[PDB]
């Protein structure tokens, strides 16, 4: 079985970064709400394809993303803008929908979290 890839970076000294009120909202409200949700745990860390015995995961998913990575990127001030962070959440959900089958429990958990995510993003503050 294949090894896991290196996880997505959560810091980079050469990548410019900043604080915006929208990024602060993403950490304090959006990530907090999803992180603490009962369906969060499959998404709280990179997929461990070795432990989960999913030898095809990283053959199929070439742009992995997870909320552990997002949480660290927010905490570490990795992002320049909110759109980068929203793209990471979209990538996470999309990967789940591509890899898994439409009836699977993981897909129903992703759908519930995505509905909550889209509600909280519609409330993003100006700036
Ligand atoms: C053949 N099967 C069918 C459906 C299975 C399914 O729906 N399992 C869920 C897992 C969550 C709890 C309820 C049951 C999933 C299999 C593989 N799989 C895909 C995954 C996925 O995309 N992510 C993001 C995370 C996990 C995962 C599972 C456990 N952790 C820590 N992370 C994961 N596992 C594939």
Tokens, residue 124: 């993003």
- What sign does the dihedral 65-70-76-79 (CA atoms) show? positive
100 lines ligand 1 (CB under 6 A): yes
For residues 113 and 37, the answer to whether their CB atoms sit within 8 Å is yes
Q: Which atom of ligand 1 is nearest to the CA of 43?
A: 24
What's this structure's resolution in Å? 1.2
43 lines ligand 1 (CB under 6 A): yes
Tokens, residue 120: 């909280």
Query: Which among 77, 8, 6, 70 is positioned nearest to 35, based on CA atoms?
Result: 70
- How were these coordinates obtained? X-ray
Give the residue, by CA position, lying nearest to ligand 1 atom 15: 106
């Amino acid at each position: 079985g294949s090894m896991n890839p290196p996880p997505p970076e959560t810091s980079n000294p050469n990548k410019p970064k900043r604080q915006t009120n929208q990024l602060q909202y993403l950490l304090r409200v959006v990530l907090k709400t999803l992180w603490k949700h009962q369906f969060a745990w499959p998404f709280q860390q990179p997929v461990d394809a070795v432990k989960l015995n999913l030898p095809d995961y990283y053959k199929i998913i070439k742009t992995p993303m997870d909320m552990g990575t997002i949480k660290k990127r927010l905490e570490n001030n990795y992002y320049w803008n909110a759109q980068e962070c929203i793209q990471d959440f979209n990538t996470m959900f999309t990967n789940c929908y591509i890899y898994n089958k439409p009836g699977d429990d993981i897909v129903l958990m992703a759908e519930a979290l995505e509905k909550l995510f889209l509600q909280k993003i519609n409330e993003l503050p100006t700036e």
